[PDB]
Design a protein around this ligand. Structure first.
Ligand SMILES: Nc1nc2c(ncn2[C@@H]2O[C@H](COP(=O)(O)OP(=O)(O)NP(=O)(O)O)[C@@H](O)[C@H]2O)c(=O)[nH]1
Lengths: 44, 246, 267, 214
RNA sequence: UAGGCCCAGGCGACUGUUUAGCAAAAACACAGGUCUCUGCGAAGCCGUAAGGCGAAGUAUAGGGGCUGACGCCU
RNA sequence: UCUACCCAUGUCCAGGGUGAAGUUCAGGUAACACUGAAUGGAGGCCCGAACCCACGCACGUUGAAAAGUGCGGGGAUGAGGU
């Protein structure tokens, strides 16, 4: 049976990428929160 | 006219098809073509607004000419072709000037006929004239509403209207649906009744033919566990002489 | 011989007895082809102190003269009788007035007692494979009961409210637990009303052939594309063809119930 | 006096919605109008024929019904709307669809302006006068009860033991049961229909009381 | 490695679609029939609005209900 | 990125059957519609592999597997699968 995760590099960058986050306001808020916590990796 | 298939299968019982006895070509003209993609009843937001739509064979738009306005320059009908977008057939005209156009095909058009549109054109099938010039009693189609646009009314398959009166600065016309109303006298109209008059006797005969034509299944509201809607202060009510009470 | 008597037949008697009080009038369906043998003494013993009318359904398949004579015999016997065709309403219009005339005594007594007249409650009873459900469907015009071309279709009694005028009670067919006279059993099996997988079809076919030879020699002569009256059965059986040695018995019984022959009666 | 019979008639100045009656104590008259119902025993509700059924009309008819009084639904002003065939049934059927809670009330049509069929109002009134004050025999009433429960043996199981009448107006009845908790409003309404069909009992409400095994 | 066959009754005309993971059916859809609204910035819908679908289509054409092949009764 | 529906562009379906329209000869005729003969290759047509489903039975149920396996079964040029 097909499991729910079928990896693909293009869609991952198009949806959870840095520029997609920076395009809208809520993505910028997400980036700000992740910077505040101090996570080593942010966006995707 | 109408062809009946023999019952060689369960899905062919009672299926009837057209005859295509008024087609002289099978290839359109590259000049008068344009792309046309399919929408699924969605809109600019992507949400569904109209149900029972979507799918079907691909089509290409043919640029019809509903405005005419090519006065003088007599034209000769070159061919009559089938159009998938509308319910009628179209005709290609090679104007003597040189430019070719597409028009709706009225019933009775033979290849080689000479047509002409303008205030001095005579009364015969295929011509186009302002409503002032045409006399009482004629049958016309491709009615215009305001001068400068193109053929709003009565241009489907086998539909016709009639001229009744010539009251000043207007014309009394009766439409296909028993309506009687006045139209601005400077508007244009084409003589004759639209062809392909037997289009309404065709039996689809199968569930998949409507799928080909682009119609999706309809679910009754019961298992989904006479009020007039015309506006009551709508304009153009002063022009409606006799209502559509049928 | 013939013994068919399942348990739902036994339960039907008890249910009818337990719901006897509500009944106003009784309709007793009786086949026209065999009017005397189709009566059920077992259910008649339970049924007493109640007015009733004899109905002769499937009257199109029987000879008119013998049915009318039997109608006279029932009438002068001391009971009302009628001839009806269920599939097409022939005598269905003249039963409501008869019921009204019969029950008028109690109706006027109740009316003078000071209450509004109410609906007539009728109970339909008879042997299986007779029109006790088709008649109800015709009377109600609704097609509400289940009908079939084999005995034992319905299994439980049911109330049907025909307008504000009638309340009908239906009932599965009932047969007496043990037969006594073999001729009656043979006639019943010929007419149907039995599962036909419990009995011997060869004896039924023999009885049919001998009755035909005795009564309708001309109809036996015409038969189906053959003209002879020999002493045995094997002459007619091998008309149209290893061929079925005696399975043709079914054929003999197949057409007769469908009236491939003309109308007849066994009386 | 009408047909050698005396009568008393009272007007009530109309009634409007409770929410929008925020007047300057001029609505104090509505209390007077409500008082007349208590002293009256036959109620005539009047609806306009030119206008359709308004939601407030159903509410007003509620007060009369909850007071246990005979009701005769009346419509006026037919001179406005068309008088024709099947225009009788258009409002006759529509009233039944909307005014379900009262079905016993007879329906009368008359226009006061043109005085059409005005004299027919009293024939309705006198008939309604008797039914609001009527008693049925104890023997007969009981005999009808178990006929209804026999054909509908779906009351553990609720048991019916006795039935009789208490009041003349309106006709109250009490049934002795093993427990009144088993009584269902659907079944209680069922008993009323059978009683209303056994006899006339036209144009008057009926109330049924239930008593325990005692 | 390759079709078991023959009779009699219901139900649904047929091919198809459904409760991923208990119910594949008589349930849904379907071709045909019928009622109702709509004269064009149409009627209906999505959006607070701008802006769109219907359609670049015009009453033999589009929305919304009820039934459900085709032969004999309504 | 699983599943529901839609949009634009690609791609897949071993073999074998039945024989519609049309066309030609032609009893028939004055010629038909109807005989037959030849040609023709239509179908939400038939049998059946790849592919897609999931009707029956058995096993497994701290399983090889948090929906599988084995033997039978349905569709298989279309309202198809991807
Ligand atoms: N020719 C004819 N057939 C009739 C007549 N009445 C009933 N039938 C046939 O009898 C069959 C239905 O009989 P039915 O009334 O259901 O018999 P039943 O007594 O109810 N059997 P059960 O009680 O077990 O349900 C059908 O085949 C119907 O055609 C009639 O008057 N004439």
């Amino acid at each position: 049976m097909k499991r729910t995760f079928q990896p693909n590099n293009r869609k991952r960058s198009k949806v959870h990428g840095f520029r997609s986050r920076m395009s809208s306001k809520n993505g910028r808020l997400v980036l700000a929160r992740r910077r505040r916590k101090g996570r080593k990796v942010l966006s995707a | 006219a109408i062809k009946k298939y023999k019952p060689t299968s369960n899905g062919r019982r009672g299926m009837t098809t057209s005859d295509f006895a008024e087609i002289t070509t099978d290839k359109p003209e590259k000049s008068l073509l344009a792309p046309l993609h399919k929408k699924g009843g969605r809109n600019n937001q992507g949400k569904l607004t109209v149900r029972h739509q979507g799918g079907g064979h691909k089509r290409q738009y043919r640029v019809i000419d509903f405005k005419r306005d090519k006065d003088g320059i007599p034209g000769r009908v070159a061919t009559v072709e089938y159009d998938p977008n509308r319910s009628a057939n179209i005709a290609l005209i090679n104007y003597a000037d040189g430019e070719k156009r597409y028009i709706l095909a009225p019933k009775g058009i033979q290849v080689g006929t000479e047509i002409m549109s303008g205030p001095e054109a005579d009364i015969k099938v295929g011509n186009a004239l302002p409503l002032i010039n045409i006399p009482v009693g004629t049958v016309v189609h491709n009615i215009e509403l305001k001068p400068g646009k193109g053929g709003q009314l009565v241009r489907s398959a086998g539909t016709s209207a009639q001229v009744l009166g010539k009251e000043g600065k207007y014309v009394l016309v009766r439409l296909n649906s028993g309506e009687v109303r006045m139209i601005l006298s400077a508007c244009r109209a084409s003589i004759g009744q639209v062809g392909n008059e037997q289009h309404e006797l065709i039996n689809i005969g199968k569930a998949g033919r409507s799928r080909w034509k682009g119609i999706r299944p309809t679910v009754r509201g019961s298992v989904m566990n006479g009020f007039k809607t015309r506006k009551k202060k709508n304009k153009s009510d002063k022009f409606i002489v006799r209502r559509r009470k049928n | 011989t013939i013994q068919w008597f399942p348990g739902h037949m036994a339960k039907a008697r008890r249910e009818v007895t337990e719901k006897l009080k509500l009944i106003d009038i009784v309709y007793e369906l009786v086949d026209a082809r065999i009017p005397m043998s189709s009566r059920n003494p077992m259910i008649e013993d339970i049924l007493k102190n109640k007015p009733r009318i004899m109905l002769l359904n499937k009257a199109d398949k029987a000879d008119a003269a013998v049915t009318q004579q039997w109608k006279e015999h029932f009438e002068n016997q001391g009971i009302r009788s009628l001839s009806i065709n269920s599939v097409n309403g022939q005598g269905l219009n003249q039963i409501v007035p008869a019921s009204k005339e019969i029950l008028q005594e109690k109706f006027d007594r109740m009316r003078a007692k000071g209450v509004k007249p109410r609906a007539i409650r009728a109970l339909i009873i008879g042997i299986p494979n007779v029109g006790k459900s088709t008649l109800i469907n015709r009377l109600a015009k609704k097609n509400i009961a289940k009908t079939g071309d084999r005995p034992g279709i319905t299994t439980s009694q049911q109330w049907v409210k025909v307008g504000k005028e009638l309340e009908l009670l239906d009932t599965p067919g009932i047969l007496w637990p043990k037969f006594e006279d073999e001729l009656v059993g043979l006639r019943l099996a010929v007419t149907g009303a039995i599962k036909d997988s419990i009995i011997n079809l060869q004896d039924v076919a023999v009885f049919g052939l001998r009755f035909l030879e005795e009564h309708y020699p001309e109809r036996l002569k015409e038969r189906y594309g053959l003209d002879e009256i020999p002493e045995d059965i094997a002459e007619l059986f091998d008309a149209i063809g290893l061929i079925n040695y005696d399975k043709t018995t079914e054929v003999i019984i197949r057409d007769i119930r469908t009236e491939k022959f003309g109308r007849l009666s066994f009386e | 006096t009408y047909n050698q019979q005396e009568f008393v008639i009272v007007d009530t100045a109309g009634m409007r919605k409770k929410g929008k009656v925020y007047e300057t104590t001029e609505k104090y008259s509505v209390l007077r109008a409500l008082k007349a119902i208590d002293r009256s025993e036959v109620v005539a509700v009047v609806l306009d024929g030119e206008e359709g059924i308004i939601e407030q009309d159903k509410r007003i008819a509620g007060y009369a019904h909850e007071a246990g009084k005979a009701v005769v639904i009346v419509v006026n002003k037919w001179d406005a709307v068309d008088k024709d065939e099947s225009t009788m049934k258009e409002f006759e059927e529509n009233i039944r669809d909307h005014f379900q809670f009262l079905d016993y009330a007879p329906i009368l049509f008359m226009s006061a302006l043109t005085k059409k069929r005005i004299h027919t109002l009293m024939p309705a009134i006198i008939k309604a006068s008797e039914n609001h004050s009527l008693r049925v025999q104890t023997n007969v009433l009981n005999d009808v009860i178990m006929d209804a429960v026999a054909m509908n043996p779906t009351p553990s199981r609720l048991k019916i033991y006795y039935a009789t009448q208490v009041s003349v107006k309106p006709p109250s009845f009490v049934v002795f049961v093993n427990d009144p908790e088993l009584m269902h409003f659907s079944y209680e309404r069922f008993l009323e229909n059978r009683i209303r069909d056994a006899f006339g009992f036209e144009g008057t409400p009926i109330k049924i009381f239930a008593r325990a095994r005692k």
